[PDB]
């Protein structure tokens, strides 16, 4: 359960500033390590963030085309693994391509999604020797990823809270005639929320309710009675502020741009080539 989970206790953070602090600490500790092991080759924290966003998108694409069909819980677990890993690790040390593959590999095991290593790596658009090398790298990085997650493998995703809220609306909020028409747009919003750092800052129930409420507002439906009456005033204020801050995080999101991403990819390949 989330309310006593490791996700709530150890991997939900107070603010965007705290996340920026952890990422800047990672970038600076890699810089100190490299300098002690010996320049414009280094990537800046914002460049690391652009690369991490691009590679989270790559991980989502890989999980999407995966066969056998990857459950949405596995994909969410893998993306959360990726975010958590790069909270405290530089892409300049561990390459995000291999880390994202290891995230999917570990999430499949944790979720109890049954796939063998050959069928896992057969999903890559590469060469069989390239697939073998990728599997070797994933196996080498599996324990590293587990250690970097501090052995907290269970990830609570917003999808089941979303379904529970849909059930609760369909049962107890007759003002909303058919809550199911809210799902699609809310699902879209869920995806957008997943792009930001919200998964490290708010509970899955808060994320799911924010998506549903945003869908309702996009539909012209007022659902404030659901919060006031069905959910039974300070707490209402904190909840409303959490939802508005989440919507603002979605609004302030900047997707990676092609040219800067290509330049940063060249920089990262140079970082991994050197030393």
């Amino acid at each position: 359960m989330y309310h006593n989970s490791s996700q709530k206790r150890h991997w939900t953070f107070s603010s965007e500033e705290q996340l920026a602090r952890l990422r800047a600490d990672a970038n600076r500790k890699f810089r100190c390590k490299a300098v002690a092991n010996g320049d414009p080759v280094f990537l800046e924290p914002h460049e690391e963030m652009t690369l991490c966003k691009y590679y989270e998108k790559r991980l989502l694409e890989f999980c999407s085309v995966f066969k056998p069909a990857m459950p949405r819980s596995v994909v969410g677990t893998a993306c959360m693994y990726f975010k958590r890993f790069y909270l405290n690790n530089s892409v300049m040390e561990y390459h995000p391509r291999i880390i994202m593959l290891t995230c999917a590999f570990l999430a499949c095991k944790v979720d109890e999604f049954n796939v063998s290593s050959p069928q896992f790596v057969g999903n890559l658009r590469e060469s069989p020797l390239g697939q073998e090398k990728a599997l070797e790298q994933i196996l080498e990085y599996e324990l590293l990823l587990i250690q970097q997650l501090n052995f907290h493998l269970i990830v609570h995703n917003p999808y089941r809270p979303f379904e529970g809220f849909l059930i609760d609306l369909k049962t107890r909020y007759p003002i909303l005639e058919n809550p199911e028409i809210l799902r699609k747009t809310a699902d879209d919003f869920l995806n957008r929320i997943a792009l930001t750092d919200a998964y490290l800052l708010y509970t899955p129930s808060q994320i799911a309710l924010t998506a549903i409420l945003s869908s309702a507002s996009r539909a012209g439906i007022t659902m404030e009675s659901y919060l006031s009456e069905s959910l039974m005033r300070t707490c209402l204020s904190q909840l409303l502020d959490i939802m508005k801050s989440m919507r603002n995080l979605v609004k302030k999101y900047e997707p990676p741009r092609s040219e800067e991403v290509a330049v940063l990819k060249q920089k990262l390949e140079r970082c991994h080539s050197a030393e």
């Binding site: 309310h3 609570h156 979303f162 529970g164 509970t203 129930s205």
Partner: protein, 65 residues
């Protein structure tokens, strides 16, 4: 030195979840998938899935870091 049952006190930081046996009469079970005869034979009921969904929808909704 007798024993007395104490209900499990775990804060969920969210709205109260209706008890499992109540779900069917409260209208919740009209919005979940019915359990097939094989599932019911094995002991799986739609009440379990509905209760899990509601518990997850309500868990930590009011909590803040």
């Amino acid at each position: 030195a007798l024993y007395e049952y104490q209900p499990l006190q775990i804060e969920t930081y969210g709205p109260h979840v209706p008890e499992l046996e109540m779900l069917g009469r409260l209208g919740y079970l009209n919005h979940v998938r019915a359990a097939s005869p094989q599932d019911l034979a094995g002991g799986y009921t739609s009440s379990l899935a509905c209760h899990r969904a509601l518990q997850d929808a309500f868990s930590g909704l009011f909590w803040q870091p």
